[PDB]
Amino acid sequence: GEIQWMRPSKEVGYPIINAPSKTKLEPSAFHYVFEGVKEPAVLTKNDPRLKTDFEEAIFSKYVGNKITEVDEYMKEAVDHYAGQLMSLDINTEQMCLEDAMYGTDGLEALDLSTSAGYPYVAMGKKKRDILNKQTRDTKEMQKLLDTYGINLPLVTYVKDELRSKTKVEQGKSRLIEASSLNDSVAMRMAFGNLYAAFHKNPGVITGSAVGCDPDLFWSKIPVLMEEKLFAFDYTGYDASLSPAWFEALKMVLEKIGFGDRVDYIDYLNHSHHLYKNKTYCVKGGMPSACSGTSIFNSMINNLIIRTLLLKTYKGIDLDHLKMIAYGDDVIASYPHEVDASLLAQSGKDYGLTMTPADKSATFETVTWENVTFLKRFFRADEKYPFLIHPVMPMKEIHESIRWTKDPRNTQDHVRSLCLLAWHNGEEEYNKFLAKIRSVPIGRALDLPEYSTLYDRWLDSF
Ligand code: NA
Incomplete structure (x- = not known):
């Protein structure tokens, strides 16, 4: 991901967006009963604790785009993953507007608590004023879709959460890039059944864990894994994704019956955002917006690992790669030992920064004893x-x-x-x-x- 340009929103026809400047996080009744060192993330450039420019710190995640096109290893990865998903017989028809709004089997209803995004955030209109769970009314939404359309700017919010002292001082606050309600609805109608199929099939076929219940799922994971485990962490996964990875994702969608609406992926790839009194354009980078977001990040992770294995180990048998991803997090396996350090090296060429699993200083063998997931x-x-x-x-x-x-x-x-x-x-x-x-x-x-x-x-x- 790379920010193409940034400038005053007024210059491009957009209003200033109001965002809270005070954390809702405060010491609990147990603050002194338990040990801890984390505190609320910096939410504004005027935070006393800052030790460097805030704006620069929060947008520094966009390290750039290392690749332009989809090479041959990526195409092979695409073919293999798509073929695998084909076995799930995923319903490829669009989901009706009602279900996309209030949910259905395998897809929970829209969260009435989260931001409605632009332009509703600037018109003072809220989700509760548009959605009605008791009636499952779609009349108000439909009217809003016809009026403001889709492909609206994403509203950027700083995420109010706990962070280490270092991250507070370095202004390393994470961001929320909220898609407009119109886009969330449109995206869920287009890919609703895909999301449902993934939510209902956590495991090594979807290569995804989204919608899983750890208390029950943990007992099932060991059985799906091959003999030798391997894993690694990513530094700024979402933001590091180059446009080519989005193109590879579209190819998968096309192959499994959704070639119909791959245009929606472009909206995620080449996107524009609103932050305070500024607007900016980003080439690449997955917006952190919803469950749709996490599912696509998971699919791309499946493409990435397959690509690095093909590039690093010609002759590898992807049919014996058993992996499960949750966004950037992943637990993988293969019948033979692989070198995560080597994979990380090949990764740099694809724009990915890979480091030892669980903050290790060096790349060590991953075992059932030291492996972690979520x-x-x-x-x-x-x-x-x-x-x-x-x-x-x-x-x-x-x-x-x-x-x-x-x-x-x-x-x-x-x-x-x-x-x-x-x-x-x-x-x-x-x-x-x-x-x-x-x-x-x-x-x-x-x-x-x-x-x-x-x-x-x-x-x-
Ligand atoms: Na983007």
Whole structure:
């Protein structure tokens, strides 16, 4: 991804967009009960904690475009992945407007909580004023589609979340590029059934994990994997994607029956954004806008890994590459050992910056003991080995419980953390509950005990 130009929105006919400048994150009742070092990400250039230009820092993710066209290794990757998806017999017909709005099997309804994007954000009109879940009315939407059309600018928001001290000082805040409601709706009508098929088929055929339930999915993953695991992290995955990867994605779509609307991918590839009082054009780079976003990033990840394996290991048997991606995150395998360091080297030529799995200093062998997916380790249950626990380290949970975005959601927030934490074992879990109950807010919460969660887990299979 590369920003082509940036200038005052007024100069191109667009209004200034208002964006909050104060985080909703504040110390929780457990701020001093647990250890943590993360704090709210910088949201404005005037933040006292800054140690460098904010604007420059947030847009520095657009490192450029390393490639222009789709080479032969990419075309082969496209053929192999498309052929694989062909086995799913994905319904290729457009999804009706109602279902695209209020959902259907395999696709949840539009989030009435998120931004409606342009021009609604500037007209003060909100999703709640357009959508009606009780009636599933499409009249208001349809009228809005006819009026403002599609391919509208994406509204950029700084993401209000916790970040390390270094990232705060370096102004490395992540961005949200919200597509207009018109585009989200249009995109879901065009690819709704594709999204549904992926959501319903997490695994090594879709090569995707979007819509998965870790508590149940972890027990299924080991079986789908080949003998030798391999993995790596990406630095700024979304923004680093070159236009060629979007073209390769369109080829896949064309081959599986959606050649009909590959034009929608162009909107993601060559896109224009609104940020505050500025507008800019980006060539390449996946906008972080929705579940559609994550599915396409996942499909591209499948194309990337296949491409690097073909370029690095001529004669590789892609039919034995077993991988599952969630956006840029991935867990992969092959019958033979591969060199992640080599793959990373080939990756640079395709515009991808690949580093050792889980922040390792060097590229080390990935095993069932040290591998992580969605920040979770894999651990066989002590009593029933065939049941696999998704284990997220307590460190992350501790960091999260120390802050709140709304005192009214304390119960939900803490329960959600408990569902993640108990997998660390009964001893650790009880210590967690005892600390929570060391303050009045914690004592008033209705939280599940260990045996209750374990029984609930067994009963969910
Ligand atoms: Na883009």
